[PDB]
C-alpha cells in the first residue's frame, strides 16, 4: 500500500489500453486482454488480493460529475 | 437522514393504488394494458433521442472523438443538462421492466 | 342442386340490392373458393344467355407476366367489364382469369369492394384457412 | 422463375361447377437459425460516454487496412503513426475521418455545403487534408488508409487512399426444388389511401391461397417465408396509434394462419430509438400470439434461411448517409456501405446508438449472401463481385404505400422479381 496506489494510477492513464472513465478497472483490464494489446500481470495481482474496496476497484475520477 | 430508511412501495400505473406484489397494472385496470404500455414507450423513445444529441456535442466542443470529456464549465448549459437525462433514462428504463421482457436472450 | 344457388344468388343480387364477391358467397353458402367462382360464372352465363339486357354488371381479375423495361414483373389487376381485352393484349403471358364480382347499379371506384370483404371477415374470425387451397401443418393454436 | 411456372398447367375457372377442386400443401421450412444475438440487448446500462466505441473501432479495423495497403502499394511499406512524421517524406497513415461541416444543426433535403473540410484523426491528434480526394462523397466515421507527405503549413497532401473491403464468404449448398421468399416494407396502416387497402387485401389474398387458378395456387404454395421490414404504422403527427395496433393484429392473424412471418420495428414503431432496436412487446397483439408461426425480431436482422444467409435493416443507415453526402442512388449507397466494411459508419455522430464498450458490432465479420435495405422509394436489384470468390445480391425493397410493390427472391437461382398490385380506380375512358 502507497506503492500499489500509484501502479493503478499509472495503469489508468496509459493511452494504449483505452479511454476509460466510465467503467470499472478490471473490466478494462479484461477488455485489453481479449484484444491482447499487452496488459501487464501486476495490475491483475493487486485486484485479487483485495476485496471490493472502492479505492482499488474504481477509476480515478469515479467521483467528479463528468 | 430519514430518507435512507425507504420502503419503496410499488404503485399501479393506471390509477395510483399502492398494493402488494410487483406487477405494473391494477386488477380493476387490466383490460386496458396494451394502451398503458403504448403510453410511456413514446416517452422512453424521446428520452433516448435527448441523451444522444447532448453527449456527442461535448465531443465536438472538446475537439477529440477518441478521449474522455472533462469540462465542468458552470457557465455552459451543456453541463448539468447532460447530468439529469442519465437519471431520467435510469428511471424510465426501470419502469418498463415492470412489464416482462419481449423475448428470451440466452438462445 | 343448380336451382338452389341460382335462386339464392337471384335473391341476393336483384332483391336485397347487395354486392356479392366470391368470398362473401363462399362464407354464406359454406363453399370452396374456386367452386364459388365457378358458381358466379354459371349464374352470369345463364342470365346473360337468357335475356342479354339485364341490370347486371361484372368485374373480373386478370393476372400474368409483363416486361416494362427489360425486367420481368408480374402484374395482377381487378378490372371492369369494358377494358378486359386491351389489358389482356398488353400482357405477355397469361396466368389467371376468373370472376370477382357482380352488381346491380354501377359504382364509381373500388371503394365498397373492400368494405364487403372486411365486414364479412369481421364476424367470421376463427376461420380464414377453412376454405383455403393451401393447408399448412405447423400453424395450429399452441401459445 | 415464378410467373413462368404459373402458366404451366390447364385453366379450369371459366367453367360451371365441378365435383372436386384441387388443394395443396405449404412447403416445409426444415432449416432455420437466428444468429442476431449481438443485437439483442439483455442488460442495457446507460451512463457511459461515446469514446469507448471509436477506440475499439480503430483497434479492430487497423490490421485489415495495414494488410490491404501492403498489397495495394507494395511491401516496401512506410506505415507510420501520425506523430512520427518528418516533413516531406512518403508514408501511409491509417486513421478515422471527421468531416467538419457547417449547416449541421447543433442543440442551441440535403445538408452538404460547398465548403467543408476533412480531418484525419487518430487517438492522440488530428491533421487537415487536401489534395486528390473527394470532399462530398465521404462522411464522418469511415476508417481508411492514405498515402502522402506532411507539407510546410502543417497540412497533408494526399495521392491515393484505400478502404477496408469485403470480408470472407463460405459457399452455400445448392438446392433441389426452388423455394421463394417474399419481402414487403412500409404498409403505412394509419393513413395513406384506400387503394393501399385493396392492395394489401390482394397481396394477403394471393399469398394465403384464396386468389387465382391452380397455377397461382401452386406457385404461391412454394413461397416458404414472409419478411415484413419496418415502418408498419406510418404516422402523420405524434403530438391514432391505439386503433392501428388492432388492425395490425388482425393482419398478422390472417398471415399467421398459413405462412411463417417475421416482423421488424421501423422508424415509427413502438420501440426504442437507438440502433439495435429490441423486439416488439407481445402485449399489443392478443389475437396473433395464438400461433407459433409469428415471430417478432428487431432492426439489424440476421438469419440463415435454408442455407442462404440474410442480413438487413429497415433503411435507417442508408437514408442517414443520404442526408450528409452527395450520392443519390440508394443501391449505390448500399454497395458503398458494403465496401467500407461497416453497416452504419455515421454512428454515433448523426444517428444514435447505444454506448457499447466491449466491441463495436456493426463491423461485418463475414460476408452475407443476400443483403437488403428497407423503405427505399423505388425497386432495384444488382449482383456484385468481390476480389476473391465473393458474390453478393443487393436488393432495395420498395415502399408499399406509394408503389404497391413487393419482391420475390428465388433461393436456388438467386434472382429477384417484382410483384405489383393495382385494382381499378375511378377510371372512365369516355371523358
Ligand atoms: S458541458 Fe457544455 S461547455 Fe462543456 S464540453 Fe459540453 S458542451 Fe462544451
Ligand atoms: Zn389500477
XYZ file of C-alpha atoms and ligand atoms in Angstrom:
756
model
C 0.000 0.000 0.000
C 1.005 3.595 -1.026
C 3.060 1.935 -3.763
C 0.162 -0.145 -5.039
C -1.882 3.060 -5.314
C 0.487 4.561 -7.888
C 0.692 1.473 -10.124
C -3.077 1.579 -10.592
C -2.966 5.331 -11.153
C -0.325 4.644 -13.838
C -2.397 1.895 -15.484
C -5.343 4.305 -15.620
C -3.700 6.956 -17.821
C -1.748 4.871 -20.339
C -3.419 5.575 -23.679
C -2.607 2.207 -25.264
C -5.239 0.347 -23.219
C -8.272 2.546 -23.897
C -10.275 5.696 -22.996
C -11.519 4.526 -19.657
C -13.509 6.796 -17.339
C -16.912 5.190 -17.405
C -16.335 1.587 -16.398
C -14.559 -0.440 -13.728
C -10.828 -1.212 -13.578
C -10.976 -4.992 -14.011
C -13.366 -4.692 -16.955
C -10.811 -2.513 -18.773
C -8.063 -4.999 -17.838
C -10.030 -7.856 -19.409
C -11.046 -5.763 -22.447
C -7.398 -5.161 -23.286
C -6.573 -8.844 -22.676
C -9.252 -10.018 -25.136
C -7.793 -7.836 -27.873
C -4.453 -8.772 -26.209
C -2.838 -5.357 -26.572
C -0.309 -6.082 -23.643
C -1.939 -6.000 -20.193
C 0.780 -6.433 -17.539
C 0.458 -9.232 -14.940
C 0.800 -6.943 -11.920
C -2.286 -4.727 -12.255
C -4.085 -8.082 -12.042
C -2.189 -9.330 -8.978
C -3.394 -6.478 -6.774
C -7.035 -6.802 -7.875
C -7.077 -10.339 -6.466
C -5.510 -9.883 -3.015
C -8.208 -7.361 -2.068
C -11.974 -7.421 -1.546
C -14.455 -4.965 -3.032
C -12.702 -1.782 -1.904
C -13.797 1.379 -3.782
C -10.248 2.809 -3.837
C -8.779 -0.153 -5.686
C -11.649 -1.334 -7.879
C -12.646 2.047 -9.335
C -11.395 4.570 -11.908
C -9.538 7.697 -10.726
C -12.404 10.093 -11.387
C -15.325 7.922 -10.236
C -16.399 10.946 -8.211
C -16.364 14.198 -10.244
C -19.684 14.924 -12.026
C -18.232 14.471 -15.559
C -31.379 11.318 7.459
C -34.745 9.599 7.340
C -34.549 9.403 3.514
C -32.370 6.282 3.643
C -34.970 4.176 5.516
C -37.198 3.737 2.474
C -39.785 1.044 1.911
C -40.233 1.696 -1.848
C -43.917 0.887 -2.174
C -44.914 -0.042 -5.713
C -47.903 1.604 -7.346
C -50.384 0.910 -10.123
C -49.508 2.707 -13.359
C -53.180 3.317 -14.157
C -54.921 4.601 -11.020
C -52.108 5.045 -8.414
C -53.144 2.463 -5.833
C -50.383 1.115 -3.616
C -50.514 -2.668 -3.405
C -48.605 -5.849 -2.561
C -46.663 -7.537 -5.477
C -44.523 -6.171 -8.341
C -46.911 -6.271 -11.320
C -47.459 -2.902 -13.009
C -51.216 -2.996 -13.624
C -54.089 -2.967 -11.141
C -56.701 -5.732 -11.117
C -59.510 -3.319 -11.984
C -57.428 -1.591 -14.672
C -56.252 -4.720 -16.586
C -58.418 -4.815 -19.793
C -56.516 -1.594 -20.574
C -52.841 -2.595 -20.563
C -51.838 -2.517 -24.237
C -52.772 1.169 -24.239
C -50.848 1.729 -20.985
C -47.769 0.067 -22.476
C -48.250 2.116 -25.619
C -48.284 5.091 -23.309
C -44.834 5.786 -21.851
C -42.796 3.957 -24.514
C -43.197 7.141 -26.584
C -41.662 8.835 -23.533
C -38.703 6.448 -23.289
C -38.280 6.987 -27.065
C -37.984 10.756 -26.579
C -35.534 10.485 -23.687
C -33.287 8.239 -25.805
C -33.237 10.901 -28.504
C -32.134 13.560 -25.993
C -29.282 11.525 -24.443
C -27.510 11.168 -27.806
C -27.782 14.765 -29.031
C -26.122 16.031 -25.828
C -23.370 13.549 -25.069
C -21.867 13.824 -28.556
C -21.971 17.645 -28.538
C -19.305 17.614 -25.818
C -17.082 15.616 -28.186
C -17.273 18.364 -30.828
C -16.842 21.205 -28.328
C -13.839 19.382 -26.866
C -12.095 18.672 -30.171
C -11.409 14.936 -29.929
C -13.507 11.848 -30.683
C -11.192 9.325 -29.030
C -10.578 10.612 -25.482
C -12.637 11.493 -22.405
C -14.552 14.722 -21.829
C -13.532 16.830 -18.814
C -15.411 20.120 -18.776
C -17.394 21.169 -15.726
C -17.963 24.673 -17.072
C -20.569 26.310 -14.815
C -21.476 28.874 -17.458
C -22.365 26.182 -20.059
C -25.967 24.955 -20.212
C -24.450 21.708 -21.604
C -23.071 20.839 -18.169
C -25.784 19.600 -15.701
C -28.270 19.256 -18.572
C -26.177 16.253 -19.575
C -26.367 15.018 -15.984
C -30.138 14.813 -15.454
C -31.016 12.858 -18.620
C -28.908 9.960 -17.330
C -31.240 9.781 -14.319
C -34.457 10.317 -16.295
C -33.379 7.442 -18.529
C -32.336 5.365 -15.493
C -35.840 5.788 -14.001
C -37.902 5.375 -17.225
C -35.972 2.258 -18.243
C -36.748 0.599 -14.904
C -40.451 1.444 -15.063
C -40.813 -0.617 -18.263
C -39.196 -3.693 -16.708
C -42.322 -3.935 -14.571
C -43.701 -5.422 -17.815
C -41.946 -8.619 -18.773
C -39.252 -8.992 -21.411
C -40.340 -9.077 -25.070
C -38.389 -12.309 -25.630
C -35.547 -14.544 -24.482
C -31.891 -13.558 -24.575
C -29.805 -16.719 -23.928
C -30.645 -18.577 -27.156
C -78.780 -28.513 -56.868
C -78.411 -25.798 -59.506
C -81.726 -24.125 -58.647
C -80.574 -23.858 -55.007
C -77.668 -21.477 -55.581
C -79.343 -19.975 -58.657
C -82.301 -18.806 -56.579
C -80.019 -17.814 -53.690
C -77.984 -15.569 -55.998
C -81.144 -14.224 -57.640
C -82.484 -13.127 -54.257
C -79.122 -11.816 -53.004
C -78.442 -9.706 -56.093
C -81.691 -8.363 -57.503
C -83.928 -8.207 -54.416
C -81.829 -7.148 -51.422
C -79.681 -4.966 -53.767
C -76.327 -6.123 -52.424
C -72.785 -6.570 -53.744
C -71.620 -10.177 -53.978
C -67.933 -11.020 -54.040
C -66.748 -14.619 -54.227
C -65.598 -14.640 -50.596
C -68.998 -13.427 -49.376
C -70.695 -16.109 -51.476
C -68.322 -18.681 -50.006
C -68.885 -17.613 -46.386
C -72.650 -17.562 -46.892
C -73.054 -20.968 -48.548
C -70.020 -22.715 -46.998
C -68.296 -23.434 -50.317
C -64.723 -23.746 -51.605
C -63.358 -20.588 -53.231
C -62.811 -21.948 -56.766
C -66.253 -23.576 -56.746
C -67.700 -20.197 -55.760
C -66.055 -18.532 -58.763
C -67.495 -21.309 -60.951
C -70.936 -20.696 -59.391
C -70.785 -16.989 -60.240
C -69.706 -17.732 -63.815
C -72.596 -20.205 -64.133
C -75.120 -17.591 -62.956
C -73.804 -14.855 -65.220
C -73.694 -17.175 -68.251
C -77.279 -18.380 -67.718
C -78.750 -14.928 -67.181
C -76.680 -13.365 -69.989
C -77.684 -16.086 -72.468
C -81.358 -15.855 -71.450
C -82.021 -12.162 -71.905
C -78.920 -10.092 -72.974
C -80.377 -6.917 -71.415
C -80.318 -7.483 -67.668
C -79.351 -4.998 -64.957
C -76.110 -6.846 -64.441
C -72.528 -5.567 -64.188
C -69.424 -7.747 -63.849
C -65.830 -7.247 -62.671
C -63.058 -9.768 -63.412
C -59.458 -10.372 -62.384
C -56.505 -10.703 -64.781
C -53.003 -11.747 -63.734
C -49.807 -12.530 -65.582
C -46.274 -11.622 -66.570
C -45.062 -8.418 -68.221
C -41.867 -6.685 -69.338
C -41.732 -2.895 -68.976
C -38.012 -2.115 -69.453
C -36.170 -5.435 -69.741
C -37.201 -6.782 -66.334
C -39.918 -9.406 -65.874
C -42.631 -8.219 -63.496
C -45.905 -9.897 -62.521
C -48.994 -7.699 -62.785
C -52.286 -8.523 -61.029
C -55.358 -6.376 -61.661
C -59.059 -6.229 -60.807
C -60.686 -4.970 -63.988
C -64.101 -3.695 -65.120
C -66.298 -5.068 -67.910
C -65.284 -2.747 -70.762
C -61.492 -2.791 -70.611
C -60.723 -6.512 -70.359
C -59.377 -7.334 -73.825
C -56.978 -4.376 -74.037
C -55.475 -5.342 -70.668
C -55.258 -8.913 -71.948
C -53.384 -7.803 -75.080
C -50.893 -5.616 -73.185
C -49.656 -8.630 -71.210
C -47.039 -11.113 -72.348
C -48.030 -14.345 -70.574
C -51.464 -15.092 -69.116
C -51.761 -16.964 -65.831
C -55.158 -16.415 -64.138
C -58.670 -15.456 -65.251
C -61.795 -15.752 -63.124
C -64.704 -13.618 -61.939
C -64.566 -11.217 -58.986
C -67.928 -9.511 -58.517
C -71.353 -8.631 -59.906
C -73.503 -5.577 -59.268
C -76.938 -4.065 -59.815
C -76.215 -0.319 -60.156
C -72.762 0.853 -61.217
C -70.163 2.049 -58.682
C -67.565 4.782 -59.195
C -64.352 3.284 -57.799
C -63.102 0.250 -55.877
C -64.416 1.600 -52.567
C -67.075 -0.813 -51.264
C -65.362 -3.969 -52.576
C -63.031 -3.687 -49.570
C -65.837 -2.805 -47.127
C -67.717 -6.005 -48.028
C -64.750 -8.374 -47.590
C -63.660 -6.567 -44.423
C -67.099 -6.762 -42.777
C -67.664 -10.419 -43.654
C -64.194 -11.108 -42.210
C -65.032 -9.122 -39.055
C -67.636 -11.554 -37.714
C -66.032 -14.726 -39.046
C -62.665 -14.530 -37.333
C -61.887 -18.090 -36.181
C -61.806 -19.334 -39.786
C -59.862 -17.947 -42.722
C -57.800 -21.029 -43.703
C -61.022 -23.070 -43.639
C -61.793 -22.725 -47.354
C -58.170 -22.088 -48.419
C -56.446 -24.103 -51.144
C -53.242 -24.331 -49.044
C -53.321 -26.181 -45.713
C -50.089 -25.848 -43.748
C -49.338 -28.125 -40.811
C -47.236 -26.333 -38.162
C -49.770 -23.491 -37.733
C -52.189 -24.704 -35.046
C -53.038 -22.616 -31.906
C -50.431 -23.548 -29.294
C -49.361 -20.442 -27.360
C -38.958 -18.130 -62.130
C -42.463 -17.716 -60.656
C -44.743 -16.297 -63.356
C -43.198 -18.706 -65.858
C -44.342 -21.672 -63.754
C -47.720 -20.051 -63.018
C -48.917 -20.739 -66.594
C -47.555 -24.306 -66.798
C -50.975 -26.010 -66.466
C -54.601 -26.002 -67.636
C -57.199 -23.381 -66.728
C -60.429 -24.542 -65.110
C -62.100 -21.479 -63.691
C -64.209 -20.093 -66.541
C -66.448 -23.156 -66.234
C -69.648 -24.330 -64.474
C -69.196 -26.083 -61.080
C -67.388 -29.378 -60.678
C -67.169 -32.285 -58.286
C -63.677 -31.614 -56.916
C -61.353 -28.631 -56.743
C -57.660 -29.112 -56.055
C -55.863 -28.342 -52.796
C -52.165 -28.195 -51.945
C -49.745 -28.011 -49.036
C -47.254 -25.452 -47.750
C -43.627 -26.431 -48.310
C -41.584 -27.274 -45.186
C -39.083 -24.865 -43.636
C -36.859 -27.709 -42.365
C -33.830 -25.462 -41.546
C -33.778 -22.041 -39.863
C -31.389 -20.387 -37.411
C -31.493 -16.900 -35.940
C -27.985 -15.537 -35.423
C -28.775 -11.936 -34.486
C -27.650 -12.333 -30.878
C -25.222 -9.326 -30.749
C -28.233 -7.049 -31.352
C -30.448 -8.459 -28.580
C -29.529 -6.398 -25.505
C -30.286 -8.004 -22.153
C -28.590 -5.744 -19.587
C -28.904 -2.202 -21.100
C -26.921 0.041 -18.774
C -26.504 3.633 -19.907
C -24.135 6.058 -18.106
C -21.100 5.667 -20.300
C -19.653 8.063 -22.839
C -19.274 7.680 -26.593
C -15.480 7.467 -26.616
C -15.286 3.732 -25.948
C -16.832 2.997 -29.356
C -14.367 4.902 -31.595
C -11.359 3.394 -29.823
C -12.457 -0.216 -30.309
C -13.472 0.580 -33.908
C -9.919 1.750 -34.698
C -8.238 -1.079 -32.781
C -10.289 -3.711 -34.600
C -10.167 -2.132 -38.083
C -6.410 -1.401 -38.139
C -4.873 -4.772 -39.294
C -7.296 -5.052 -42.244
C -6.133 -1.706 -43.576
C -2.445 -2.440 -42.999
C -2.785 -5.766 -44.819
C -4.564 -4.119 -47.729
C -2.163 -1.182 -48.084
C 0.751 -3.652 -48.272
C -0.650 -5.452 -51.307
C -2.122 -2.279 -52.788
C 1.027 -0.083 -52.674
C 3.902 -2.549 -52.392
C 5.532 -4.410 -49.499
C 8.217 -1.727 -49.210
C 5.976 -0.367 -46.518
C 6.011 3.057 -44.928
C 3.142 2.834 -42.443
C 3.638 5.301 -39.606
C 1.897 6.880 -36.627
C 0.646 10.453 -37.026
C 3.219 11.929 -34.612
C 6.377 10.315 -36.044
C 6.122 12.049 -39.420
C 9.039 14.060 -40.792
C 8.470 16.949 -43.233
C 8.102 15.926 -46.906
C 8.506 12.153 -46.669
C 6.401 9.435 -48.323
C 4.320 7.428 -45.864
C 0.991 5.681 -45.265
C -1.378 6.706 -42.440
C -4.348 4.730 -41.051
C -6.991 6.835 -39.300
C -10.601 7.969 -38.841
C -12.297 10.707 -40.815
C -14.116 13.661 -39.358
C -15.991 15.930 -41.735
C -16.219 19.498 -40.436
C -19.415 20.744 -41.932
C -21.311 23.893 -41.084
C -25.121 23.894 -41.599
C -25.257 20.697 -39.456
C -27.642 21.663 -36.641
C -26.492 21.950 -33.038
C -28.709 21.866 -29.973
C -28.881 25.634 -29.430
C -33.376 17.961 -48.083
C -29.602 17.541 -48.053
C -27.117 19.239 -45.738
C -23.919 19.331 -47.834
C -22.380 22.772 -48.315
C -19.860 23.969 -50.966
C -17.145 24.431 -48.323
C -16.401 21.771 -45.690
C -13.136 20.221 -44.601
C -11.962 16.688 -43.948
C -9.751 15.900 -40.952
C -7.824 12.688 -40.381
C -7.871 11.876 -36.682
C -6.134 9.297 -34.548
C -6.269 8.750 -30.794
C -3.679 11.437 -29.957
C -4.028 14.257 -32.520
C -5.551 15.397 -35.810
C -4.387 16.755 -39.175
C -6.063 18.553 -42.061
C -6.224 17.036 -45.525
C -6.164 18.386 -49.063
C -5.128 17.095 -52.454
C -6.784 14.483 -54.666
C -9.698 13.329 -52.517
C -13.475 13.623 -52.772
C -14.904 16.248 -50.470
C -18.620 15.400 -50.599
C -18.767 11.650 -51.217
C -17.269 10.797 -47.821
C -18.857 11.020 -44.367
C -17.610 11.272 -40.801
C -16.816 7.894 -39.250
C -15.056 5.972 -42.074
C -11.718 4.325 -41.261
C -9.193 4.270 -44.114
C -5.528 4.211 -45.132
C -3.919 7.067 -47.052
C -0.657 7.880 -48.889
C 1.337 11.111 -48.861
C 3.548 13.618 -47.072
C 3.458 16.345 -44.418
C 3.879 19.727 -46.070
C 5.095 23.028 -44.631
C 1.816 24.586 -43.445
C 1.071 21.600 -41.199
C -1.387 20.124 -43.711
C -1.166 16.799 -45.510
C -1.074 16.135 -49.258
C -2.900 13.012 -50.408
C -2.091 10.990 -53.524
C -4.303 7.924 -53.072
C -6.279 6.173 -50.349
C -7.901 2.802 -49.760
C -10.874 1.339 -47.865
C -11.159 -1.946 -45.879
C -13.230 -4.028 -48.452
C -15.327 -7.253 -48.370
C -14.909 -9.984 -45.751
C -14.597 -13.731 -46.490
C -17.608 -15.758 -47.621
C -18.098 -19.507 -47.437
C -20.127 -21.117 -50.240
C -23.750 -22.244 -49.851
C -25.137 -25.679 -50.752
C -27.273 -25.859 -53.904
C -30.987 -26.573 -53.693
C -33.164 -29.210 -55.380
C -36.571 -27.536 -55.846
C -36.859 -23.756 -55.935
C -38.253 -22.064 -52.815
C -39.228 -18.402 -52.807
C -39.146 -15.657 -50.172
C -41.367 -12.555 -50.176
C -40.168 -9.138 -48.961
C -42.523 -6.240 -48.141
C -41.956 -2.968 -46.319
C -43.947 0.023 -45.176
C -47.665 -0.795 -45.251
C -48.487 2.514 -43.599
C -51.528 1.493 -41.564
C -52.923 4.706 -40.116
C -53.002 6.839 -43.247
C -52.056 6.748 -46.919
C -55.040 5.897 -49.112
C -57.717 3.378 -49.957
C -56.008 1.873 -52.972
C -53.384 0.794 -50.444
C -56.183 -1.049 -48.618
C -57.248 -3.079 -51.659
C -53.562 -3.566 -52.486
C -52.884 -5.019 -49.035
C -56.007 -7.188 -49.348
C -54.991 -8.536 -52.767
C -51.442 -9.226 -51.511
C -52.560 -11.251 -48.475
C -55.235 -12.977 -50.603
C -52.607 -14.117 -53.114
C -50.098 -15.374 -50.551
C -52.677 -17.148 -48.361
C -54.161 -19.142 -51.227
C -57.516 -17.534 -51.866
C -56.937 -15.980 -55.273
C -56.259 -17.160 -58.798
C -56.274 -20.516 -60.566
C -54.307 -23.689 -59.803
C -51.292 -22.016 -61.412
C -51.216 -19.184 -58.869
C -52.201 -21.545 -56.072
C -49.431 -23.971 -56.986
C -46.901 -21.155 -57.194
C -47.893 -19.313 -54.013
C -47.725 -22.605 -52.132
C -43.973 -22.665 -52.788
C -43.335 -19.326 -51.030
C -41.660 -20.564 -47.872
C -41.405 -17.432 -45.683
C -42.627 -13.844 -45.320
C -40.444 -10.969 -44.024
C -42.019 -7.624 -43.085
C -39.344 -4.971 -42.712
C -40.119 -1.896 -40.674
C -42.368 1.157 -40.739
C -45.594 -0.812 -40.305
C -47.567 2.193 -38.953
C -46.814 5.355 -40.882
C -47.715 8.268 -38.630
C -48.950 11.685 -39.708
C -48.301 13.513 -36.416
C -47.464 12.345 -32.902
C -48.317 15.401 -30.788
C -54.414 7.320 -33.923
C -51.772 4.904 -32.651
C -54.080 2.764 -30.478
C -56.569 1.769 -33.197
C -53.762 0.856 -35.623
C -52.339 -1.955 -33.490
C -55.762 -3.648 -33.608
C -55.723 -3.760 -37.410
C -52.081 -4.826 -37.460
C -53.029 -7.630 -35.074
C -55.814 -8.734 -37.435
C -53.494 -8.719 -40.478
C -50.822 -10.677 -38.610
C -53.545 -13.145 -37.604
C -54.632 -13.632 -41.220
C -50.999 -14.176 -42.228
C -50.063 -16.358 -39.242
C -52.750 -18.840 -40.312
C -50.803 -20.110 -43.355
C -47.194 -18.804 -43.556
C -44.399 -18.173 -41.056
C -43.895 -14.404 -40.588
C -41.016 -12.244 -39.225
C -41.840 -8.709 -38.056
C -39.275 -5.913 -37.609
C -39.580 -2.481 -35.968
C -39.018 0.623 -38.001
C -38.701 4.395 -37.918
C -42.154 4.806 -36.403
C -42.971 1.700 -34.353
C -43.473 1.364 -30.575
C -39.854 0.599 -29.591
C -36.729 2.496 -28.546
C -34.791 4.982 -30.664
C -31.173 3.756 -30.591
C -29.956 1.488 -33.312
C -30.038 -2.108 -32.003
C -33.816 -1.869 -31.741
C -35.328 -4.518 -29.487
C -38.346 -6.667 -30.427
C -41.928 -5.540 -30.038
C -43.680 -6.443 -26.800
C -46.292 -9.216 -27.247
C -48.926 -7.447 -25.103
C -50.117 -5.363 -28.071
C -51.094 -8.450 -30.133
C -53.789 -10.535 -28.397
C -55.032 -12.483 -31.411
C -51.857 -13.305 -33.345
C -49.892 -14.790 -30.444
C -52.101 -17.901 -30.527
C -49.920 -19.370 -33.301
C -46.246 -20.297 -33.197
C -45.696 -19.185 -36.797
C -45.459 -15.472 -35.921
C -42.060 -14.139 -34.816
C -41.016 -10.660 -33.671
C -37.365 -9.547 -34.195
C -35.848 -6.011 -34.445
C -33.714 -3.753 -36.739
C -30.332 -5.370 -37.712
C -31.713 -8.824 -38.568
C -29.531 -11.782 -39.499
C -30.800 -15.242 -40.395
C -29.874 -18.489 -42.163
C -32.947 -19.327 -44.268
C -32.355 -22.728 -45.939
C -28.588 -22.329 -46.160
C -28.712 -18.851 -47.681
C -27.802 -16.254 -45.053
C -29.646 -12.930 -44.903
C -28.848 -9.610 -43.239
C -30.928 -6.474 -43.405
C -32.192 -3.265 -41.855
C -35.283 -1.085 -42.158
C -33.451 1.631 -44.064
C -32.101 3.944 -41.386
C -28.396 3.775 -42.211
C -28.921 4.371 -45.945
C -31.066 7.479 -45.549
C -28.659 8.826 -42.924
C -25.776 8.530 -45.397
C -28.103 10.121 -47.983
C -28.516 13.165 -45.726
C -24.822 14.030 -45.291
C -23.312 13.005 -48.640
C -23.796 13.587 -52.350
C -24.729 10.119 -53.639
C -28.355 9.709 -54.770
C -28.703 6.090 -55.914
C -29.806 4.002 -52.923
C -28.421 0.794 -54.439
C -25.052 2.547 -54.799
C -25.155 3.741 -51.172
C -25.935 0.184 -50.073
C -22.943 -1.144 -52.023
C -20.688 1.620 -50.649
C -21.750 0.655 -47.110
C -20.673 -2.843 -48.093
C -17.312 -1.554 -49.391
C -16.086 0.109 -46.153
C -16.925 -2.980 -44.004
C -19.432 -1.193 -41.771
C -23.244 -1.298 -41.727
C -23.605 2.245 -40.365
C -20.422 4.339 -40.276
C -22.280 7.548 -39.297
C -22.942 6.318 -35.752
C -22.744 7.910 -33.312
C -22.489 11.334 -34.832
C -25.812 11.902 -36.620
C -27.536 8.543 -35.991
C -27.941 7.488 -32.382
C -26.811 4.173 -30.990
C -26.309 2.517 -27.674
C -22.975 3.294 -25.960
C -21.216 -0.073 -26.277
C -17.824 -0.573 -24.699
C -16.505 -4.083 -25.397
C -16.749 -4.466 -29.193
C -18.400 -2.483 -31.986
C -21.000 -4.847 -33.537
C -21.553 -3.023 -36.853
C -18.305 -4.291 -38.390
C -19.029 -7.165 -40.806
C -17.317 -10.327 -39.501
C -18.316 -12.392 -42.551
C -19.927 -11.793 -45.895
C -23.674 -12.349 -46.365
C -25.098 -13.959 -49.468
C -28.076 -11.557 -49.573
C -28.039 -8.003 -48.210
C -31.202 -5.906 -48.394
C -32.387 -2.490 -47.290
C -35.626 -1.042 -46.085
C -38.017 1.690 -47.115
C -36.433 2.849 -50.471
C -38.546 4.908 -52.909
C -38.170 2.532 -55.890
C -37.253 -1.040 -56.699
C -33.693 -2.007 -57.551
C -31.503 -5.082 -57.528
C -27.971 -5.968 -58.567
C -25.197 -8.554 -58.309
C -21.675 -7.567 -57.251
C -18.390 -9.436 -57.098
C -15.555 -9.414 -54.616
C -11.813 -9.574 -55.191
C -11.841 -13.203 -54.080
C -14.677 -15.573 -54.910
C -17.344 -13.448 -53.208
C -20.696 -12.685 -54.856
C -23.482 -10.710 -53.181
C -27.040 -9.968 -54.305
C -28.224 -6.463 -53.350
C -31.956 -5.661 -53.163
C -33.689 -2.427 -52.261
C -37.252 -3.063 -51.085
C -39.824 -0.513 -52.265
C -42.434 1.219 -50.116
C -45.901 -0.325 -50.363
C -47.945 2.808 -49.678
C -46.993 4.533 -52.948
C -45.785 1.894 -55.421
C -47.670 -1.181 -54.098
C -44.735 -3.439 -54.996
C -43.109 -6.389 -53.185
C -40.140 -8.610 -54.077
C -39.756 -12.364 -54.674
C -36.305 -13.839 -54.101
C -35.576 -17.272 -55.534
C -33.348 -19.386 -53.291
C -31.827 -21.594 -55.998
C -31.202 -19.218 -58.914
C -30.763 -16.215 -56.568
C -32.724 -13.687 -58.577
C -35.296 -11.104 -57.553
C -38.558 -10.317 -59.338
C -41.006 -7.504 -58.511
C -44.717 -8.108 -57.884
C -47.187 -5.259 -58.253
C -50.857 -4.951 -57.268
C -53.330 -2.457 -58.718
C -57.088 -2.521 -58.517
C -59.025 -0.318 -60.867
C -59.661 3.190 -59.622
C -62.210 5.847 -60.515
C -61.405 5.276 -64.169
C -63.739 6.107 -67.033
C -62.312 6.210 -70.554
C -65.154 8.179 -72.176
C -64.418 11.702 -70.886
S -20.528 20.707 -20.999
Fe -21.013 22.402 -22.414
S -19.101 23.675 -22.383
Fe -18.526 21.671 -21.502
S -17.762 20.477 -23.281
Fe -20.012 20.007 -23.096
S -20.980 21.488 -24.496
Fe -18.860 22.262 -24.143
Zn -55.328 0.312 -11.028
